[PDB]
Design a protein around this ligand. Structure first.
Ligand SMILES: CCCn1cc(COC(=O)[C@@H]2CCCCN2C(=O)[C@H](c2cc(OC)c(OC)c(OC)c2)C2CCCCC2)cn1
Length: 128
């Protein structure tokens, strides 16, 4: 189970070191350069919640997913996680709810206290 493999073999990339965001790398990228806060970032991803009740992908178009890193435009987990990734990398994250949607959740899509899993490919980044 990709999520179990991460829960068991994944690196804790939080600062508080509370296992709230766990990472395994799946395809090593190119270079040493990983993006900076305020970079426009381009990714393809697949995401599910632990309930198994919802699944989302960017792949539900050709359009890639585009955000400004570190600006809280996404969940904290992504601002943390993607910032560790190199151009061309693919990685798995498992996220406790405190780094996703927390106790409030985001109903009706995300319930209260949900745990999330993502597969992420980092295509490229550029300074805004
Ligand atoms: C500038 C991008 C702004 N944006 C933020 C979001 C909120 O989503 C997230 O921050 C994270 C990480 C970025 C990819 C989408 N994210 C999600 O959680 C998905 C997500 C996709 C969504 O649609 C693509 C979405 O609606 C906007 C949403 O709302 C909370 C959350 C979940 C993953 C669990 C399975 C169901 C969806 C959606 N668009």
């Amino acid at each position: 189970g990709a999520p179990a493999t991460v829960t068991e073999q994944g690196e804790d990339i939080t600062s508080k070191k509370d296992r709230g965001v766990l990472k395994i790398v799946k395809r090593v990228g190119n270079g040493e350069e990983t993006p900076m806060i305020g970079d426009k970032v381009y990714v393809h991803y697949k995401g599910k919640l632990s309930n198994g009740k919802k699944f989302d992908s960017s792949h539900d178009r050709n359009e890639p997913f585009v955000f400004s890193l570190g600006k809280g435009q996404v969940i904290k987990a992504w601002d943390i996680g993607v910032a560790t990734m190199k151009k061309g990398e693919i990685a798995h994250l498992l996220i406790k709810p405190e780094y996703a949607y927390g106790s409030a959740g985001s109903l009706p899509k995300i319930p209260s206290n949900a745990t999330l899993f993502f597969e992420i490919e980092l295509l490229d980044f550029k300074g805004e």
